[PDB]
Design a protein around this ligand. Sequence first.
Ligand SMILES: O=c1cccccc1O
Ligand SMILES: [Zn+2]
Length: 257
Amino acid sequence: HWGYGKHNGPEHWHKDFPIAKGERQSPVDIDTHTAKYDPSLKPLSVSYDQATSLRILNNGHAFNVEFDDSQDKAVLKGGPLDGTYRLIQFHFHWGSLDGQGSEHTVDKKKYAAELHLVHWNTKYGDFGKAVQQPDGLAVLGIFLKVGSAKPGLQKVVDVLDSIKTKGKSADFTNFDPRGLLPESLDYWTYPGSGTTPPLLECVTWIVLKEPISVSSEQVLKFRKLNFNGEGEPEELMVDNWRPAQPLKNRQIKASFK
Ligand SMILES: O=c1cccccc1O
Ligand SMILES: [Zn+2]
């Protein structure tokens, strides 16, 4: 089955998921000079005050912090979006070394990691119906650089010992994802896809310009997780990023001058 190794990595995905070579795949390189300011974009509205986290799960490719999405509680709207998108989960992608790990790149620069806050369009009733639609998802992408610690990340780092291997979960209530956001909500946006199989082309990407800083100790702890299940040979969960894909017939728009 798919993964991030030599034999089952991103270059192989297209055999089981032909949409891998589709017209609006993600991630992409953001060429900052070629991304045009769009003064018709709105400010992003991130309303996470009532977000209810439930659980954290190692799914064998990342860890997901899952939210209760059965009511309108943690929503994204505005910016490029029409309508209301509900947060369902966040996760990260990261590297084996600080010099790589992000999925999106900025003028070919790779950040140490990238956070994805996944939201589904509430006009489609739930996540599963939303991923049958070209405007089903909105993903807020936030870059991580290594420097100062992010205090709001620490509750996540500290629970990872308890979900080391694939299939493990832990209760993870009362986690406030506002503590993962940078100061500025300036963003780039484009139409694209999920970045893991099944790579569905549902996503309005909203990629914040400002990274967050995390400490070397915080990212080191991500790197102790395992792709494998308990009792299987240990394979460190590192380099769980898909490289930049061809832009094709798309324009990346900037919310800022
Ligand atoms: O960020 C993601 C969002 C939606 C679907 C699939 C995979 C991802 O990494
Ligand atoms: Zn992701």
